[PDB]
Design a protein around this ligand. Structure first.
Ligand SMILES: CCCCCCCC/C=C\CCCCCCCC(=O)O[C@@H](COC(=O)CCCCCCCCCCCCCCC)COP(=O)([O-])OCC[N+](C)(C)C
Ligand SMILES: CCCCCCCC/C=C\CCCCCCCC(=O)O[C@@H](COC(=O)CCCCCCCCCCCCCCC)COP(=O)([O-])OCC[N+](C)(C)C
Ligand SMILES: *[C@H]1O[C@H](CO)[C@@H](O)[C@H](O)[C@H]1NC(C)=O
Ligand SMILES: *[C@H]1O[C@H](CO)[C@@H](O)[C@H](O)[C@H]1NC(C)=O
Lengths: 953, 953
C-alpha cells in the first residue's frame, strides 16, 4: 500500500510539475474565493457565550431560574482601603472599648458619601435613545420596582446605615448611662447597626433608623470587609455596590446599562487618580471582564505577524545551498520562502473565511492563535519535501518534472500521514463542550486540511517554476535580472548532513552514550509519571486577563478583604404543595416544626464552612411568612367599613382594623389553604415599617413566582458562599452545594403531594463556567485515548510500518505525552479545556517527530542495526530537525509576548514543552531504541520501491 | 492553446485511468456529502413568493399599501348558472315589462340562501387551536371590526337585498298604481335595488331595506353577472363572495383562514355534486391556486423518472458493438450506461443538496424540470467521449491508460467548451427578476458545472475499469460470471459510420441537393423572421394549472359572466395638506369645485373603458365628506347638556342636538382646519342610517390612515377595472392606470403645500405579477445578446477556430434562435421569464450541435472542400446525432405527459423545437455552408497534434 501511495502521488506530482502556472491559478482562485468571507467575521465577547456548554445541566438550571425569577442582577463593586491610617482606641460606653480601624475616620466617609452622591446623578448621553440616561432608568429596585427615583435604587454601602445624610453623619448627642454621661457619635450607631441590621430604631440616645435608604436592610458583610468574626469596628476595606437590573441579549436597556457602566468606570478612574495619599481604590463592572479579555486581541496582533517574516527569512536561508559566495543570489530559495508563507497564509485565511460564511462567530483565541499555530504546524511538510527533492540525484536523461514527481512520490506518504494525524486529532479535540475551544479546534482542523490540499498542488507547481528558474541559472528572487554573466557550476555535499555525519551520529550511537540516554529517558519518564499526581485541575479566572489590567488588583482586594462570596439560590422547582401543613412544616426552622428540615439543614451546613461552602444561613420566605401571620399587628383586616375583611397596612393606626390577621393561637401559627392563598400576596407586598419589621417586599419580592390563580409555581432560598479564591475552591463549593441540595430533595420528596420530578438545585452566577472541572479528567483521558487509537491505527497502514515500528511509535507518543503532562504540572500550568486541546494537538504533532525517523529506519539495507540507526538519523534526523523544530520555534516563541496571560501561559509554554520534548525524543531516544530493539530489516521493502519509479516515469 | 488544452486533459486522463477505483471513491464521497443536504429541502408554494421580483416597484407600492391600510382582503367566490331555464316575461307595473332570466326563479334563490346560511355556521376543527373556528373569528368586517358575529361578516350576494330572510323572499303585497292594482313580489324590490343600491327604503308598496345585512351597500356587479348595461333582470349568473381578513405570513390566523378555506371548498364540492339538473356551480378560494399549481409536482414525478431508464437502455445498446450475435453479452456497455446515469443523478442531487444547505428554497419547476433537463443536456459529453475512444486505433505497444488519456486529450476541448457555454448561459439567464426562474437557472448552472467535474474524473475512471473488463474478455454487465469459454476475437467497421458513409454524405453533399437545402434554410429563416412579429408577450394565468383542475371552469365562468374585474386603489402617498381649501377642491367632483380634478378625471377616464381599463368611477371620501357636512341633520352638536358641542349621532331624535354640524351655507360647504380635524373622525365612524344615507363607516372606514394627532397620512380611492381576460389585457390595464395616476399626480403637485415626493399610484391585487411584461422584451433581447457575445468569444479561443469558422458558428446560433422564436410564435407559446430562460438554454445548447462539426471540418487535410465536408460530417455528424439528438429526445419527450400545462407548454414544446432545429441546422445546413464558404485548411493544424500525443505518452 505504501508503494501504491508513492506511485499515486508520483503520478500526480509529475503531472502538476508539467503544468505549473495553470494549476497555480486553479489553486489560487478558490483560496481567494474562500478568503473573501472575512468581511462576514463577528467576534463573540461575553464569557457566558465563550466559556459555557449551551446544552449543559448548569445552563438548563440558569435558563429555568432566568425564566421563573428573571435574570441575576449585575454588580458594580468599589473596594477602598486606608494604606497609612494605623488605628485609634474609642469606648462607646455601651459596648465597651473598641479599636476603630483607620479607614473608619469621619473625613474618609464624607469623601465616600460625596463619591456615592456624585455617582447617583451621573448620566450618559446614550446616542441610541438621544436622551440622558439616569441611574433610576435601569437600577435594580428590590422595593417599589415601578416609579423608580435616585432614592429608590440598590446602592449597598456603609453610608446606608445613615440613609446617605451629612447631618446624621455629623450628628452627636449626650447620653447618661448609669450616672456617667458621654458623647454618642455615628460610631455607636454603626456598632449597633453591624450587630443587628434589621432595626427601625437605634436606641442608644439617637432615634436613627438603621434600615437602608431604599428600605431593604443592608447586611454588614455587604458594606465592610477585612474583619474576622464580629469585630466590625476593625473593618479594613469599605465596599459600595451599584446593583443594576439585567436584561436578555436583545433588549436595548442592556446597551443603556453598558453605557452607564462605562461612565461609572470613567468616574471611578477620575476618583482613583484624584485620591493618592488618602485612599487606595479598586473597582469593576459587569462589562469590565468582557472588555478586558478582548482588549489585547487587536493591540498585540501586529507584534505576532513578525513570526511570518522570521519563518520566511529562515526558510529562504535554510534551503539555499551557499557554497560559492558569488552565486548566493542564484541558490538562495526566496521564491519557495514566499511560496511557503503564502500557502500557510492562504490556508488559515480560507479556513477563517469558510467558517465566517456559515455564520460561525470567531473569538480572541482564533485570531491570536490559529494563524501562528497552523504556521508552526504546516511548513514542515514543504520543508521535508524540498530537502528530499534537493537530496535526490537526478538520473541521466530525466526531465525535472519526473524528478519532482519522484521526490513527491518518496515523501508523500509521510506528509499525508502527518496532515491526517493532525486533522483527526483536531477534529476529535473539537468534542470539547466549550464553544470557543470547539470553534478553535474545528478552524485548526479545516486549516490543516486546506494547507495539505494547497501543499499538494500550489507549492509543487511553484517548486517546479523555482527549479525551472534555477536550471536557466537566473537570480535567486528577482528573476527579471537573469544570469549576472557566467556563474561557475554548483555542486555540494550539504553542510547539515556534513555536521550530522561528522559529529552527531558517531557521538549519539557511541557504545557508552546509548546506555546513558536510555537510563536518562527512563528516569525522566518515571519522574514525570510521579510528578503528574501534583496537577491542578481548573482554568483560573484572573489568569485569562492581561498582566496590566486593573481587575488583577480588584481580584487581589476581593480575595484579601471580602467576607462572603457569591450568593447561592437553593431554587425549588414546581410540583410542591406549599398550601399544605406538612409542606410548610418541612421548610421551617422555628419551634413547632419537624427536625432536620430544609432551612435547619442549611443552618447546620453553615456551621462548618470548610466542608460545606456556605458561610451564611438561608433567608426563608415561609419562616418569615409564619412569623408575619403571628398576632403582633403586622397583618390586620377591617372590623367594619366598605373594605370588609381586607388587609389594612401596618402603617395605618386607625381603630377600623383592630381584628388580628388570623384566629386564636396557642401552639404554632399554621394558616389553612384559604388563609395561605389569601395572605401570601399580602405578605409578599407588605413593605417593612417601624410598627413590625417582618415583610415580604424587603427580601422576598421576586423570591416567589405566583401565577394569576394564586398557586406557588417556584421559590428560591438565598444563602452566601464563603470567600471563594481559586478555581478548586469554586468547583468544591458547587460540588458541596449540589450534594447538599440532592440530600435536601431526598427528604422533601417523601412529603405527601410532592411531584416525583420536583428538584432543589443550588443556582449561582458562577455555576455556568466552573462546573466542567467536576468531570474534565474522565473526558480528557477518554479523548486522549480516542486520539491515540486512530493515530497508531492509520500510522501502521499509511506508512506500511511493521508491528515493532508502530509499537515504538505509540510508545514514543505515550512517553512524550506523559512527559508533557509531568512538566506541565511542574511549571505551574493548570489542566482544563485549553490545556486539553493543546495536549490533543501534541498527540497530533508528535507523529512529525517520530514517524519520519521510524520509516527512514524501516526502509534500509545496512548489514547491522547500528549502521541502519546511523544512516536513518543522518538521512531524516537532519530533515526532521531542520524542518519541524526550526519551523515550530519561530511561530511559537512570538506567543511569549502575548501580554494576555491566557495565551502566554496555555499556548506559548505548553507548545514550547511539546516542541522541545518532540525534538529530544524524536532525535535522541528513537534512534537509540531503534539501534537496540528496532525491527529486523528485509530486502523486499527497498527492492519494491524501484518497480514504482521507472514504471510511472 | 487548443493543443495545450489537449495535452493538459491527456495528462489528467492518462493519470486518472491509471488509478480508477481510488478516484471513483474520491469523486463519490463529495457527491454523497452534498446529496445528503436534500433533507433540508423547503418548497415555496405562494405565487407572491414565486412570481414576484422582491425589490420591484409594484412590490414597494404593495408593501406601502399593506403598511398604511392593512393587507388586501382574500375573496372566496361562488358562480352559479341555470343551464336549462329559458325565460319568463313579467311586468312590475312601475318599470314596465321585464324578461326575467331562468336563474332568477324563486326556488333557485331559496337553495342559494340555504347554501349561504349553511356556509355561515360552517366551522373547522383547527387542530392547532383545538377549538371550532367559526366565520366571525376571521371574516372581513367593513362595519364594526370588533365584536364580530355571523351577522357582521362581508358576504356579498343577491340575497343581501333581503338581509338573508326567507319571509322577505316569500313576501308579497298589493299595490294600486294610477287605479290598476297588482302583486309586488321580491322581483320589483330586486329591480328597484339594482338601479340604486344605497336606499334605506324601497318605496314600491314594500317597506324593505335595500341596504345589505352587515350594513354596507351591495353593488349590482358584486351579486349578479352576465347582463350588458342596466338590464339586471337578464342576469345569467348569481355570485357569492365570502371575503376574509388577510394577515402576514407569520400570523396563525392565516393558517385558521386556510383551514376555513379548505372546509368551504369541501362544502362547495358537496353542493356541486348535490345539484346536477338544477345548477352548474363553480367556486375558488385564496388558497385554491397555491394548492392547484403544487398538486401535480408529486403525482407526476414517478412518471418522469422512467426517462432515466430509457436513456440507460439507449446508452447501453448504442455503445455496445454487436457484430457476432454470440458475444453481445461481452460488448454491450451496460457498466458505462449505469455509470452515465449515476453521474447525471449524482450531479443533479449534489446541486439540489448544496442549494438546500444554503437554505435556498426549491419550487415545482426545480423538482419537475432540473433532473430531466440536466439529464438531456449532460450525457452528450460522455457519449462523444466513448464514441471517440472506440473510434481511435490503439498504437502497437501502448497501454490502455495512455489510449484513454489520448482519447480524452482529443475530445476534452469540445466537452469543456459545451459545458462552459451551458454554465455561462444558465448563470446569465439567472439575472431574471422572478425568484423561481432565478433559483432554477442557478440550480441548472451548478448541476452542469458538477456534471462536467464528475465526467472528467468519475466516468473516465469507470471507462478505464469497463475497458479493463473488456480486455479480460468478461461478460457485458455481470463481470462475476467472467468469460463463457473462448469468445471469437471482435473487430468491426461501425454500422453508424457504415450507414452515414454509404447513404448520408453522398446524398447530402450531392451537387443538386446542396442548393435545395441552402435556399430552403434561407426561406425558412425569412418566414421565421416574418412570423416573429405575430408573438404574444406575457405568461397566461390559467395555463400554469393542470388540465383537470376546477379553476379552469371557474376562470371560464369568470371571463364569460363577470362585469367588473379587480378593484384598483388610487393610493395617494403622504405629504398632502387635505386640511386646506385648494387641497379638498382639487379632489372634488360636485359643484363649487375646480374643473379636471382627481375624481372628475377618473369619472372622465371611465367614459371610454377600452382606452382606459376602469369600468366604474372612484368612490371619494372627500366628496362624501363635504356631502356629509351639508346641513341635512347627519352631523349635529348638543345645543345644551354635559356633552356641549359634541357629535350626537343621526340615530338619536332628541331636541338636545338641533344645532347643525357647521355654520350658514350659501355657496359650497368647505370646512376650516379646526372643522376638518374635528369632523373627520366623526365622518369616518358615522354608520349610515335611514335619516341620511351618507356615512364614512360604510366604505371609507380603513380608506383613510389617521395618526393620533388627527393629520391624514395617506388615503386610497376605490375604482373597478373592466373584465380583464388575457395577460395582455391586465398589462394594458396596469399601463393605462399608471399613465392616468402620473397624469393626476402632475395636476395634484401644482397645489400649494404638496411635498414634491407626493405620488398617486394605482395599486391592485394582481399588479405584483403582470408588471414585468411592460419591460420584458428589452431585458430579453439584452440578455440574449449578453449570452451570444461570450459564447462566441470563448468558442473562438477554446476550440482555436479561425474567424470564418467562429462567424459561421455565431450565424448558425443566431439562425436557430430566430427559427425557434418564429416557430414559438407560430405554435402558440407566449413569451415570458420561462420562455426567456428556455431560449437562453437554447443559446447554451446549440454549441453542442454546431461547434463539434465546425471543429471536425477545421482540423482536416483532404484536398478539396467537398471531401473535407464529407469526412467531417461522417467523423462527427454521426457522433453529434447519436449522442446529442438521441440523448436530448428521451429526457424531453417524457415532459409531454406533464399534466401541468406550464411544463407541457413551456418546457416540452420549446425544448423539442430547440432540439429538432439543433439537429436540422447542425447536421444539414452547417456541412453544406462549410462545403461552400468554409475556411481554407492549413496543414499546421493537424501536424501540430502529433507533437502533443507522443510527447505526453
Ligand atoms: C475556474 C475557472 C477558470 C479557471 C481557469 C484559469 C486557467 C488560466 C491559466 C492559463 C495560464 O496560466 O497560461 C497557460 C496557458 O496554457 C495552458 O495550458 C492553458 C490550459 C488551461 C486549462 C484550464 C482548464 C481547467 C478547467 C477545469 C476547472 C475545474 C477547477 C476546479 C478547481 C477547484 C500556460 O500554461 P503553463 O501552466 O505555463 O504550462 C506550460 C508548461 N509546458 C510548456 C510544458 C506546457
Ligand atoms: C476524503 C477522505 C478519504 C478518501 C480516501 C479514500 C481512498 C480509498 C480507495 C482505496 C481503493 O479503492 O483501493 C486502492 C488501493 O490502492 C491505492 O492505490 C490506494 C491509494 C489511496 C490514495 C488516496 C489519497 C488521497 C488523499 C487526498 C484527499 C483529497 C480529496 C479531495 C477531493 C474533493 C486500489 O487502487 P486502484 O485505484 O484500483 O489502482 C490500481 C491500478 N494499478 C494496479 C495500476 C495501480
Ligand atoms: C444631561 O446631562 C448633561 C451633563 O453635562 C447636561 O449637559 C445635559 O444638559 C443634560 N440633558 C438633559 C436633557 O437633561
Ligand atoms: C364544533 O362543531 C362540530 C360540528 O360537527 C361539533 O361536533 C362540535 O361539538 C362543535 N364544538 C364546539 C366546541 O362547539
Amino acid at each position: 500500500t505504501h508503494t501504491l501511495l508513492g506511485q499515486f502521488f508520483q503520478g500526480w506530482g509529475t503531472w502538476v510539475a508539467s503544468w505549473p502556472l495553470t494549476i497555480l491559478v486553479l489553486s489560487v482562485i478558490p483560496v481567494v474565493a474562500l478568503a473573501a468571507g472575512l468581511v462576514f467575521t463577528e467576534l463573540t465577547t461575553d464569557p457566558v457565550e465563550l466559556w459555557s456548554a449551551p446544552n449543559s445541566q448548569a445552563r438548563s438550571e440558569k435558563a429555568f431560574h432566568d425564566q421563573h425569577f428573571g435574570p441575576f442582577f449585575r454588580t458594580n463593586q468599589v473596594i477602598l482601603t486606608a494604606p497609612n491610617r494605623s488605628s485609634y482606641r474609642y469606648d462607646s460606653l455601651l459596648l465597651g472599648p473598641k479599636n476603630f480601624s483607620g479607614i473608619l475616620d469621619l473625613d474618609l466617609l464624607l469623601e465616600l458619601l460625596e463619591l456615592q452622591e456624585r455617582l447617583r446623578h451621573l448620566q450618559v448621553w446614550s446616542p441610541e435613545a438621544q436622551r440622558n440616561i439616569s441611574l433610576q432608568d435601569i437600577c435594580y429596585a428590590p422595593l417599589n420596582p415601578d416609579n423608580t427615583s435616585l432614592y429608590d435604587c440598590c446602592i449597598n454601602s456603609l453610608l446606608q446605615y445613615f440613609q446617605n445624610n451629612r447631618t446624621l453623619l455629623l450628628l452627636t448627642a449626650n447620653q447618661t448611662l448609669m450616672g456617667q454621661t458621654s458623647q454618642v457619635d455615628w460610631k455607636d450607631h454603626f456598632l449597633y447597626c453591624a450587630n443587628a441590621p434589621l432595626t427601625f430604631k437605634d436606641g442608644t440616645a439617637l432615634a436613627l433608623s438603621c434600615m437602608a435608604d431604599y428600605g431593604a436592610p443592608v447586611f454588614p458583610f455587604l458594606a465592610i470587609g477585612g474583619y474576622k468574626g464580629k469585630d466590625y469596628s476593625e473593618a479594613e476595606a469599605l465596599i459600595m455596590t451599584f446593583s443594576l437590573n439585567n436584561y436578555p441579549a436583545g433588549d436595548p436597556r442592556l446597551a443603556q446599562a453598558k453605557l452607564w457602566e462605562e461612565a461609572f468606570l470613567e468616574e471611578m478612574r477620575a476618583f482613583q487618580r484624584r485620591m493618592a495619599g488618602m485612599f487606595q481604590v479598586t473597582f469593576m463592572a459587569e462589562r469590565s471582564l468582557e472588555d478586558e479579555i478582548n482588549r489585547t486581541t487587536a493591540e498585540d496582533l501586529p507584534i505576532f505577524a513578525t513570526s511570518y517574516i522570521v519563518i520566511f527569512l529562515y526558510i529562504s536561508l535554510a534551503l539555499g545551498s551557499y557554497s560559492s559566495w558569488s552565486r548566493v543570489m542564484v541558490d538562495s530559495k526566496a521564491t519557495l520562502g514566499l511560496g511557503g508563507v503564502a500557502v500557510v497564509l492562504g490556508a488559515v485565511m480560507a479556513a477563517m473565511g469558510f467558517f465566517s460564511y456559515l455564520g460561525i462567530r470567531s473569538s480572541l483565541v482564533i485570531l491570536q492563535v490559529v494563524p501562528f499555530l497552523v504556521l508552526s504546524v504546516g511548513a514542515d511538510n514543504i520543508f521535508i519535501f524540498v530537502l528530499e527533492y534537493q537530496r535526490l540525484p537526478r538520473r541521466p536523461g530525466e526531465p525535472r518534472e519526473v524528478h519532482i514527481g519522484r521526490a513527491l512520490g518518496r515523501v508523500a506518504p509521510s506528509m499525508l500521514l502527518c496532515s491526517l494525524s493532525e486533522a483527526i486529532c483536531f477534529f476529535l479535540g473539537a468534542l470539547t463542550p466549550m464553544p470557543a475551544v470547539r470553534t478553535f479546534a474545528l478552524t485548526s482542523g479545516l486549516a490543516v486540511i486546506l494547507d495539505f490540499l494547497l501543499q499538494m498542488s500550489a507549492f509543487v507547481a511553484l517548486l517546479s517554476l523555482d527549479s525551472k528558474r534555477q536550471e536557466a541559472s537566473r537570480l535567486d528572487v528577482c528573476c527579471c535580472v537573469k544570469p549576472q554573466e557566467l556563474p561557475p557550476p554548483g555542486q555540494g555535499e550539504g553542510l547539515l548532513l556534513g555536521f550530522f555525519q561528522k559529529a552527531y551520529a558517531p557521538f549519539l550511537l557511541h557504545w557508552i552514550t546509548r546506555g546513558v540516554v536510555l537510563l536518562l529517558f527512563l528516569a525522566l519518564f518515571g519522574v514525570s509519571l510521579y510528578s503528574m499526581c501534583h496537577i491542578s485541575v481548573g482554568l483560573d479566572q484572573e489568569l485569562a486577563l492581561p498582566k496590566d489590567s486593573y481587575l488583577l488588583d480588584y481580584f487581589l482586594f476581593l480575595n484579601r478583604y471580602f467576607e462572603v462570596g457569591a450568593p447561592v439560590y437553593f431554587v425549588t422547582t414546581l410540583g410542591y404543595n406549599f398550601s399544605s401543613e406538612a409542606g410548610m412544616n418541612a421548610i421551617c426552622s422555628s419551634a413547632g416544626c419537624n427536625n432536620f428540615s430544609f432551612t435547619q439543614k442549611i443552618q447546620y451546613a453553615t456551621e462548618f464552612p470548610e466542608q460545606s461552602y456556605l458561610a451564611i444561613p438561608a433567608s426563608s420566605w415561609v419562616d418569615d411568612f409564619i412569623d408575619w401571620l403571628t398576632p403582633s399587628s403586622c397583618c390586620r383586616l377591617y372590623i367594619s367599613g366598605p373594605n370588609k375583611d381586607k388587609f389594612c397596612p401596618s402603617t395605618v393606626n386607625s381603630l377600623n382594623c383592630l381584628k388580628n390577621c388570623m384566629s386564636i393561637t396557642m401552639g404554632s401559627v399554621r394558616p389553612s389553604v384559604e388563609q395561605f392563598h389569601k395572605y401570601l400576596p399580602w405578605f409578599l407586598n407588605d413593605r417593612p415599617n417601624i410598627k413590625c419589621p417582618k415583610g415580604g417586599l424587603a427580601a422576598y419580592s421576586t423570591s416567589v413566582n405566583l401565577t394569576s390563580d394564586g398557586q406557588v409555581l417556584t421559590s428560591r432560598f438565598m444563602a452566601y458562599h464563603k470567600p471563594l479564591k481559586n478555581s478548586q475552591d469554586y468547583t468544591e463549593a458547587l460540588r458541596a452545594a449540589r450534594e447538599l441540595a440532592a440530600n435536601i430533595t431526598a427528604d422533601l420528596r417523601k412529603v405527601p403531594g410532592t411531584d416525583p420530578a420536583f428538584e432543589v438545585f443550588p443556582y449561582t452566577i458562577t455555576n455556568v463556567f466552573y462546573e466542567q472541572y467536576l468531570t474534565i479528567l474522565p473526558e480528557g483521558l477518554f479523548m486522549l485515548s480516542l486520539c491515540l487509537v486512530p493515530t497508531f491505527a492509520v500510522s501502521c497502514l499509511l506508512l506500511g510500518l511493521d508491528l515493532r515500528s508502530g509499537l515504538l511509535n505509540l510508545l514514543s507518543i505515550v512517553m512524550i505525552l506523559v512527559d508533557t503532562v509531568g512538566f506541565m504540572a511542574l511549571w505551574g500550568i493548570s489542566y482544563n479545556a485549553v490545556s486539553l486541546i493543546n495536549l490533543v494537538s501534541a498527540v497530533g504533532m508528535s507523529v512529525e517527530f517520530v514517524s519520519h525517523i521510524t520509516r527512514s529506519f524501516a526502509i534500509s539495507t545496512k548489514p547491522t542495526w547500528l549502521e541502519r540507526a546511523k544512516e536513518a538519523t543522518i538521512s531524516m534526523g537532519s530533515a526532521v530537525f531542520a524542518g519541524v523544530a526550526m519551523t515550530n520555534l519561530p511561530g511559537i516563541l512570538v506567543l511569549g509576548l502575548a501580554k494576555a496571560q491566557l495565551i502566554q501561559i496555555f499556548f506559548f509554554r505548553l507548545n514550547l514543552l511539546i516542541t522541545l520534548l518532540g525534538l529530544l525524543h524524536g532525535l535522541v531516544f528513537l534512534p537509540v531504541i531503534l539501534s537496540y530493539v528496532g525491527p529486523d530489516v528485509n530486502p523486499a521493502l527497498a527492492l519494491e520501491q524501484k518497480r514504482a519509479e521507472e514504471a510511472v516515469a
